[PDB]
Design a binder for this molecule. Sequence first.
Ligand SMILES: *C/C=C(C)/C=C/C=C(C)/C=C/C1=C(C)CCCC1(C)C
Ligand SMILES: *C/C=C(C)/C=C/C=C(C)/C=C/C1=C(C)CCCC1(C)C
Ligand SMILES: *C/C=C(C)/C=C/C=C(C)/C=C/C1=C(C)CCCC1(C)C
Lengths: 215, 215, 215
Amino acid sequence: PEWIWLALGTALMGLGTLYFLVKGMGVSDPDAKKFYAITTLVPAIAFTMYLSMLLGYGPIYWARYADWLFTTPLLLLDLALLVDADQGTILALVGADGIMIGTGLVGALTKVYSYRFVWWAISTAAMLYILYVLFFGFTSKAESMRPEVASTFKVLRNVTVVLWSAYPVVWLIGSEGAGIVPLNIETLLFMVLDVSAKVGFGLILLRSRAIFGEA
Amino acid sequence: PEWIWLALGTALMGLGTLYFLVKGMGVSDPDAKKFYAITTLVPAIAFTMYLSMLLGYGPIYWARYADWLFTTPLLLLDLALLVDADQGTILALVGADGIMIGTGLVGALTKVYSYRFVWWAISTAAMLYILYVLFFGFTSKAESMRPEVASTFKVLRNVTVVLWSAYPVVWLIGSEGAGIVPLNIETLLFMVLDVSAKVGFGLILLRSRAIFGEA
Amino acid sequence: PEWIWLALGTALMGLGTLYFLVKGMGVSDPDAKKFYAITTLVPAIAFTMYLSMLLGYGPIYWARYADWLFTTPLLLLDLALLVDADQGTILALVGADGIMIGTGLVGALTKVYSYRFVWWAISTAAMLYILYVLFFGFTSKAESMRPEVASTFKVLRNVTVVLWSAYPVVWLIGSEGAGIVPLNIETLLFMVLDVSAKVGFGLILLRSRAIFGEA
Ligand SMILES: *C/C=C(C)/C=C/C=C(C)/C=C/C1=C(C)CCCC1(C)C
Ligand SMILES: *C/C=C(C)/C=C/C=C(C)/C=C/C1=C(C)CCCC1(C)C
Ligand SMILES: *C/C=C(C)/C=C/C=C(C)/C=C/C1=C(C)CCCC1(C)C
């Protein structure tokens, strides 16, 4: 049953945003304030999205794609700011991201596997672009920061590249591809990916000192 | 009849944007330019929104929520810039705001009062968050500005906290709550709130000297 | 037949984004990076939009307006950054732009010519506002830049004011106005306008030295 997977997701996202809110209450360093604000909004949004999916009962799920659409940009912003990335490259990441999600929604809404295949390819190309920049460009840029920031980025980088790559694969084994995995399980896996990519990521970032200004 | 309430709203928003446009024509100070641009766009958008509601004849009103969705962020930006608020806190205000409106639209589109109640609660929590930051954080921040800017902010702060709080209450006495107030009146009250919160706010801000750079 | 007009558009937008991507691969100057990122995203988005129109077969076209909605803002950003335009004026351009497109979509979705006429007027007023600022304000601002940047802007300015003005006229001879031009031709003309206003504009900008920082 999906309701219990959607119930838990709603819970963990809600708990994570609450916890993030508590830990950030007494933060004066403006650098940290941005990270807290950015990072707390991500899971705050997924929260409302999962709640709508939970109350939704009574395939295709717009809430699932809207969540991704609004939250992925903030996630990259976190990484961007952490490494003091250039505005152009930041703008390129978000645009590529917006394309990755929008394009993936069209595929989901398409019937002809052939067509869906094209949308899937464009989406994955967009994701690979984003990951490429995260793994390489950002790592080099992160090399000019104090070790504390460099190492925190590396962890977030690894977790992000890995977790993000699993989405199209989970999407592939679901109903839009090799129909191996039933709906409830598909919902579960995406839930695990969503909590980890948002709350997991947030814990890693908001617990480190990296969110604090340097010199 | 709602048409005459929707007709007036269209008129006042249109007149306000026209007036704002005239007063800003000869402005060189870049600080003032931002305030004029920001402030003039708010009522320019509501204008087109009310016009669609007026021509719409021939409940539920998407134009009403889209107006709020696009304009509330700019309104907070005005206050944010006036007090030189931090980027993180600005980003947190807009996100909370986006959540407040989106969440309120889902409630409006929900049938089960129970469900609608939850959406209402999340929305009001988001608004209270925004107001909390406006009344306290911004006031402290406003304390570091010349008296002219400090006092103009206080007025906008008061008018905003008061006017904004009336929305959920008006929403409550309408058809989604205690069905005490009929449709035409509901439309009227929201119109009065919209004109005051946009044109009223604009007059207060664009007439003061606060919009001008300091040192 | 529209498919071949929509097929070519998909091709030219795709080729342009590919070419833009190649030329920008080895760019370190952050000034140039922004221009490449901004400029490459515009045609990358139109690409996916035209592809959906092409695969769409199997009037009214949302993809056509969404393309414009998401891409016109970036186009103005290019011009804005090139002339180091003020934030307020940038914010005013995008808002006016968002209004121009949204308002034009409502007109297209309206049946009563009379109503459609009003939407058309508001949209054209918004465009004239944008052009007015581009031709005058930006030109003056461009006068404070080295001749290389001044002259590149002038060309983009001319091409933009001319190409953009042709849209409402093409819209006028189509089915929402003087039904002189059939659908396939209408689609063709808009395609020519889209490729020129995006790829054409991009070639002009990304080939010049203007995208490089100065002092
Ligand atoms: C909080 C949510 C996160 C981090 C979501 C990330 C999502 C992706 C990387 C999704 C990618 C997809 C493709 C590459 C193609 C197939 C469809 C998608 C949308 C699942
Ligand atoms: C120009 C429009 C303005 C200033 C609108 C402000 C709107 C709000 C503060 C709306 C709040 C609502 C709730 C808190 C819950 C119930 C539903 C809403 C959307 C009316
Ligand atoms: C890449 C696309 C570009 C540059 C599109 C530009 C579009 C316009 C200037 C459209 C204007 C319109 C009006 C002024 C009124 C009638 C309807 C429109 C949307 C065609």
